Design an enzyme around this catalytic site. Structure first.
Site, PDB file in Angstrom:
ATOM      1  N   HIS A  61      24.547   5.354 130.754  1.00 54.68           N
ATOM      2  CA  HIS A  61      24.437   6.385 129.708  1.00 54.68           C
ATOM      3  C   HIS A  61      25.013   7.717 130.197  1.00 54.68           C
ATOM      4  O   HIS A  61      25.813   8.367 129.508  1.00 54.68           O
ATOM      5  CB  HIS A  61      22.964   6.578 129.323  1.00 54.68           C
ATOM      6  CG  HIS A  61      22.303   5.311 128.872  1.00 54.68           C
ATOM      7  ND1 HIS A  61      21.318   4.676 129.601  1.00 54.68           N
ATOM      8  CD2 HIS A  61      22.517   4.544 127.775  1.00 54.68           C
ATOM      9  CE1 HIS A  61      20.929   3.587 128.950  1.00 54.68           C
ATOM     10  NE2 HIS A  61      21.641   3.486 127.842  1.00 54.68           N
ATOM     11  N   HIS A  91      20.849  15.621 135.114  1.00 53.40           N
ATOM     12  CA  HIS A  91      21.956  14.862 134.568  1.00 53.40           C
ATOM     13  C   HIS A  91      22.665  15.781 133.569  1.00 53.40           C
ATOM     14  O   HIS A  91      22.212  16.904 133.299  1.00 53.40           O
ATOM     15  CB  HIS A  91      21.424  13.628 133.839  1.00 53.40           C
ATOM     16  CG  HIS A  91      20.513  13.967 132.703  1.00 53.40           C
ATOM     17  ND1 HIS A  91      19.150  14.114 132.862  1.00 53.40           N
ATOM     18  CD2 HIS A  91      20.770  14.188 131.394  1.00 53.40           C
ATOM     19  CE1 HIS A  91      18.606  14.420 131.697  1.00 53.40           C
ATOM     20  NE2 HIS A  91      19.569  14.484 130.791  1.00 53.40           N
ATOM     21  N   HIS A  93      25.184  15.828 129.710  1.00 54.12           N
ATOM     22  CA  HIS A  93      25.782  15.188 128.544  1.00 54.12           C
ATOM     23  C   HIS A  93      27.091  15.899 128.297  1.00 54.12           C
ATOM     24  O   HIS A  93      27.167  17.109 128.504  1.00 54.12           O
ATOM     25  CB  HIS A  93      24.900  15.359 127.303  1.00 54.12           C
ATOM     26  CG  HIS A  93      23.483  14.909 127.514  1.00 54.12           C
ATOM     27  ND1 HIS A  93      23.025  13.664 127.136  1.00 54.12           N
ATOM     28  CD2 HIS A  93      22.447  15.519 128.136  1.00 54.12           C
ATOM     29  CE1 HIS A  93      21.745  13.551 127.460  1.00 54.12           C
ATOM     30  NE2 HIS A  93      21.378  14.654 128.088  1.00 54.12           N
ATOM     31  N   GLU A 103      24.115  18.985 123.623  1.00 54.35           N
ATOM     32  CA  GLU A 103      23.088  18.457 122.748  1.00 54.35           C
ATOM     33  C   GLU A 103      22.526  19.571 121.883  1.00 54.35           C
ATOM     34  O   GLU A 103      22.636  19.524 120.662  1.00 54.35           O
ATOM     35  CB  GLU A 103      22.014  17.780 123.596  1.00 54.35           C
ATOM     36  CG  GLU A 103      22.584  16.579 124.378  1.00 54.35           C
ATOM     37  CD  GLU A 103      21.562  15.517 124.600  1.00 54.35           C
ATOM     38  OE1 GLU A 103      20.518  15.815 125.236  1.00 54.35           O
ATOM     39  OE2 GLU A 103      21.817  14.384 124.136  1.00 54.35           O
ATOM     40  N   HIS A 116      20.891  19.164 132.222  1.00 51.92           N
ATOM     41  CA  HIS A 116      19.455  19.062 132.059  1.00 51.92           C
ATOM     42  C   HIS A 116      18.790  18.839 133.397  1.00 51.92           C
ATOM     43  O   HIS A 116      19.063  17.826 134.060  1.00 51.92           O
ATOM     44  CB  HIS A 116      19.111  17.905 131.105  1.00 51.92           C
ATOM     45  CG  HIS A 116      19.477  18.190 129.682  1.00 51.92           C
ATOM     46  ND1 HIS A 116      19.672  17.199 128.743  1.00 51.92           N
ATOM     47  CD2 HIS A 116      19.702  19.363 129.045  1.00 51.92           C
ATOM     48  CE1 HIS A 116      19.985  17.753 127.578  1.00 51.92           C
ATOM     49  NE2 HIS A 116      19.995  19.067 127.733  1.00 51.92           N
ATOM     50  N   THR A 195      15.746  13.444 124.634  1.00 45.51           N
ATOM     51  CA  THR A 195      16.877  13.278 123.694  1.00 45.51           C
ATOM     52  C   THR A 195      17.513  11.883 123.733  1.00 45.51           C
ATOM     53  O   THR A 195      18.586  11.637 123.120  1.00 45.51           O
ATOM     54  CB  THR A 195      17.990  14.309 123.971  1.00 45.51           C
ATOM     55  OG1 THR A 195      18.582  14.020 125.240  1.00 45.51           O
ATOM     56  CG2 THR A 195      17.457  15.766 123.915  1.00 45.51           C
ATOM     57  N   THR A 196      16.880  10.981 124.480  1.00 47.71           N
ATOM     58  CA  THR A 196      17.269   9.573 124.552  1.00 47.71           C
ATOM     59  C   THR A 196      16.024   8.731 124.303  1.00 47.71           C
ATOM     60  O   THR A 196      14.898   9.201 124.526  1.00 47.71           O
ATOM     61  CB  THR A 196      17.784   9.155 125.961  1.00 47.71           C
ATOM     62  OG1 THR A 196      16.746   9.342 126.945  1.00 47.71           O
ATOM     63  CG2 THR A 196      19.043   9.921 126.381  1.00 47.71           C
TER      64      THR A 196
HETATM   65  C1  TOR Z   1      21.300  10.044 132.379  1.00 49.57           C
HETATM   66  C2  TOR Z   1      20.377  10.073 131.136  1.00 49.57           C
HETATM   67  C3  TOR Z   1      21.166  10.348 129.854  1.00 49.57           C
HETATM   68  O1  TOR Z   1      19.339  11.059 131.253  1.00 49.57           O
HETATM   69  C4  TOR Z   1      18.284  10.449 131.982  1.00 49.57           C
HETATM   70  C5  TOR Z   1      18.386   8.967 131.608  1.00 49.57           C
HETATM   71  C6  TOR Z   1      17.352   8.544 130.564  1.00 49.57           C
HETATM   72  O2  TOR Z   1      17.182   9.605 129.579  1.00 49.57           O
HETATM   73  C7  TOR Z   1      16.573  10.797 130.052  1.00 49.57           C
HETATM   74  C8  TOR Z   1      16.937  11.910 129.037  1.00 49.57           C
HETATM   75  O3  TOR Z   1      16.474  13.189 129.435  1.00 49.57           O
HETATM   76  S1  TOR Z   1      16.595  14.386 128.547  1.00 49.57           S
HETATM   77  N1  TOR Z   1      18.065  14.354 127.917  1.00 49.57           N
HETATM   78  O4  TOR Z   1      15.575  14.223 127.478  1.00 49.57           O
HETATM   79  O5  TOR Z   1      16.387  15.536 129.459  1.00 49.57           O
HETATM   80  O6  TOR Z   1      15.182  10.614 130.051  1.00 49.57           O
HETATM   81  C9  TOR Z   1      14.705  10.732 131.443  1.00 49.57           C
HETATM   82  C10 TOR Z   1      13.703   9.591 131.706  1.00 49.57           C
HETATM   83  C11 TOR Z   1      14.073  12.105 131.715  1.00 49.57           C
HETATM   84  O7  TOR Z   1      15.845  10.550 132.282  1.00 49.57           O
HETATM   85  C12 TOR Z   1      16.957  11.124 131.516  1.00 49.57           C
HETATM   86  O8  TOR Z   1      19.691   8.806 130.995  1.00 49.57           O
HETATM   87 ZN    ZN Z   2      19.558  15.117 128.914  1.00 50.00          ZN
END
Ligand code: TOR
Ligand code: ZN
Length: 257
Positions: A61, A91, A93, A103, A116, A195-196
């Site tokens: 992702h 990470h 986006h 985002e 983030h 956001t995922t």
């Molecule tokens: C690399 C990516 C996109 O972000 C990681 C992992 C799973 O999703 C996340 C999203 O975090 S967020 N965008 O709400 O800060 O949720 C967590 C579990 C915090 O890890 C983030 O995939």
């Molecule tokens: Zn994120």
């Protein structure tokens, strides 16, 4: 399973995760002329001096830079936060083109990317417990625009060739996340969600006003990453951002006038 393409992307997530249409979803558009300045908010305290990075992972992702969160080595406090939140990972986006990728949006403006830095509330003992709580996480969001290079990003960019495909990881110790911050810690804040998937409604969002600048060459290297695993047909890792969600019954507060 879930992704960002036409057939598995944000428009589809609500079927497996009905919270996708819930009461406090993220990201949102930040309407700068609707946000309320709150003079009572204490300054943000970012304490990353003892941050211990471990490893970088392409998860299909985006990519995670993971930290040792077994002690209060790197913490976020102050601002709208009650207590201490421990850095666990960061990470990004990003987009296929410089005109999209973030985002959150600011007065409908999309930035080229968004960083983030994810932190969990130590009162809940671990990250998995924290995500089950309305104040479990604090995510510090920082916009990226394309301009001059960000020197503190280069080590990240340098290692991407070694984690091109889904499931690949590399050693990523001794990285200093302080090199990713802008000068100003002015921010907007609002209660939101991951956001995922699973889109849990456990996040205090803190979004910095001041974007960082990264070079065109730096962002281009993000866009060479792959969503696919090794040996599979190439699907470039681009446009891994969820669009703005309805604000609903929420207020965005500003740390500044
Ligand atoms: C690399 C990516 C996109 O972000 C990681 C992992 C799973 O999703 C996340 C999203 O975090 S967020 N965008 O709400 O800060 O949720 C967590 C579990 C915090 O890890 C983030 O995939
Ligand atoms: Zn994120």
């Amino acid at each position: 399973h879930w992704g960002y393409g036409k057939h598995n992307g944000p428009e589809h997530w609500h079927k497996d995760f009905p919270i996708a249409k819930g009461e406090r979803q993220s990201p949102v558009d930040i309407d700068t002329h609707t946000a309320k300045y709150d003079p009572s908010l204490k300054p943000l305290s970012v304490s990353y001096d003892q941050a211990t990075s471990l490893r970088i992972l392409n998860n299909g992702h985006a990519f995670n830079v993971e930290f040792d969160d077994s002690q209060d080595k790197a913490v976020l406090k102050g601002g709208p936060l009650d207590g201490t939140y421990r850095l666990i990972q960061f990470h990004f986006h990003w987009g296929s083109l410089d005109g999209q990728g973030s985002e959150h949006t600011v007065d409908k403006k999309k930035y080229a990317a968004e960083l983030h830095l994810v932190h969990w509330n130590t009162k809940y003992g671990d990250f998995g417990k924290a995500v089950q709580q309305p104040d479990g996480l604090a995510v510090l969001g920082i916009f990226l625009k394309v301009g001059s290079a960000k020197p503190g990003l280069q080590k990240v960019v340098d290692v991407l060739d070694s984690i091109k495909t889904k499931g690949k990881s590399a050693d990523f110790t001794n990285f200093d996340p302080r090199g990713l911050l802008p000068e100003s810690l002015d921010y907007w804040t609002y209660p939101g969600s991951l956001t995922t998937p699973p889109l849990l409604e456990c996040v205090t969002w803190i979004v910095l006003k001041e974007p960082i600048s990264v070079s065109s060459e730096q962002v281009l290297k993000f866009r060479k990453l792959n969503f696919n695993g090794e040996g599979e047909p190439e699907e470039l890792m681009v446009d891994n951002w969820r669009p703005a969600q309805p604000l609903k019954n929420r207020q965005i507060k500003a740390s500044f006038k």
